[PDB]
């Protein structure tokens, strides 16, 4: 639904790299370069953003 606040396996906080991730992808950067530029070194954190599906943007479209 919404970005997890902390990576599950480790606990590293990834809940503040969602908008930065989206901004570096709009600038032309690959998902690899983008996840690198955010400080997500170990692949347990990289999967936390790489495979996130933001469904809070589709629920926030039905009437109040």
């Amino acid at each position: 639904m919404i970005i997890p606040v902390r990576c599950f396996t480790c606990g590293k906080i990834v809940g503040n790299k969602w908008e930065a991730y989206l901004g570096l992808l709009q600038a032309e950067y690959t998902e690899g370069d983008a996840l690198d530029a955010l400080g997500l070194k170990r692949y347990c954190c990289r999967r936390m953003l790489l495979a996130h599906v933001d469904l809070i943007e589709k629920l926030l479209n039905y009437a109040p």
Binding site: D36, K41, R42, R46
Partner: protein, 51 residues
Amino acid sequence: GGLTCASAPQGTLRILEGPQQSLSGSPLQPIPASPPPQIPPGLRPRFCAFG
């Protein structure tokens, strides 16, 4: 002055309309076969040890 049976027909013709076959080219697929999954060029390591 009536109609009488005449001589038996000597043959029969059966007509049908038929078109012909073209050359065998056998063009199986636009982009054919199962194209293989493959390596992204260079790639580079996306991880390092500590120290």
